[PDB]
Amino acid sequence: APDSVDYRKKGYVTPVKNQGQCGSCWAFSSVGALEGQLKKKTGKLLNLSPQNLVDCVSENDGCGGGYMTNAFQYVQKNRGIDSEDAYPYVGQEESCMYNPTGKAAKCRGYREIPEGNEKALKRAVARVGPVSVAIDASLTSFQFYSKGVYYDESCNSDNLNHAVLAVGYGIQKGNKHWIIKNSWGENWGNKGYILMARNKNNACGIANLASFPKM
Ligand SMILES: N=CCNC(=O)C1(NC(=O)c2ccc(N)c(F)c2)CCCCC1
After folding, report:
1. Ligand 1, CB cutoff 6 Å, lining residues
2. Whose CA is nearest to atom 5 of ligand 1?
3. Helix, strand, coil percent values for the chain (each to nearest 5)
């Protein structure tokens, strides 16, 4: 695998979104991983619909939370996911209103990264593209991030509570990092992104619940 990778440079990453009050981070994370595979497969980048996932993944809990693997399994079983423009985000769970005419991507399954293994996460990001990951994002230090490679000794790898998207990895001032796209809008963090410590004892649980879709 290369020493550094940044899929934003390859045009695999759509603009940062803002989930608002709804606990739909898992849907934004899943959509971002699908967007990356869609760009890799077809050469064209398009925003996909987290609302379609919120409303239609019955194995998840909508705005109450969910898993990315369940979202990928739904897209595969459903034979598609709608674009964002065809099924816009409204910030609350509704009945499933998927419309196949708005289909903009398909999924052929998924893979999970071995639990806790940041080297395997790195190899997946290098081989595949952006990977969905879960972290402890509860600390106010995480929430107030602005610059640098984030590390807080108090982060708890056993307390996963948010889902984000690893769009690359690298190093800055000698500190290995993951490049993370959040879904708290561009006013959060560094234009909506955070660099998180890599190989620092699986800081914030970054490699505990990682997965990516097949296309
Ligand atoms: N805005 C994001 C809220 N964070 C989540 O959705 C995470 N997942 C859950 O919180 C969850 C998962 C399955 C359920 N059935 C459920 F109710 C809740 C947190 C744990 C890691 C995966 C994502």
Report:
1. 23-26, 60-61, 64-67, 134, 160-163, 209
2. 65
3. 30, 25, 50
Q: Which atom of ligand 1 is nearest to the CA of 59?
A: 15
Distance from the alpha carbon of residue 71 to the mean position of ligand 1, in angstroms:
12
Q: How was this structure determined?
A: X-ray
Range of the domain at 65: 1-215
What CA–CA distance (Å, rounded) separates 47 from 31?
8
Write the CA distances from 119 to 5, 30, 123, 134, integer angstroms.
Answer: 14, 21, 6, 16
d(CA 162, CA 164): 7
Residue (of 12, 184, 208, 3) closest to 114 by Cα position: 208
The enclosing domain of 212 has a CATH number of 3.90.70.10
Asked if 56 is an active-site residue, the reply is no
Tokens at 97, concatenated: 């209103």
**What is the number of domains present in the chain?**
1
In the chain, the amino acid numbered 35 is: E
Does the annotation count 177 as an active-site position?
A: no
Pairwise CA distance, residues 178 & 189, whole Å: 14
Strands (E), the chain: 5-6, 81-82, 103-105, 109-112, 131-135, 149-150, 162-172, 175-181, 193-197, 211-214
Phi first, then psi, for residue 80 (nearest 5°) are 160, 165
Catalytic residue among 22, 25, 56, 204: 25
Amino acid type, 22: C
For this entry, resolution in Å reads 1.0
Largest Cα separation within the chain, whole Å, is 49
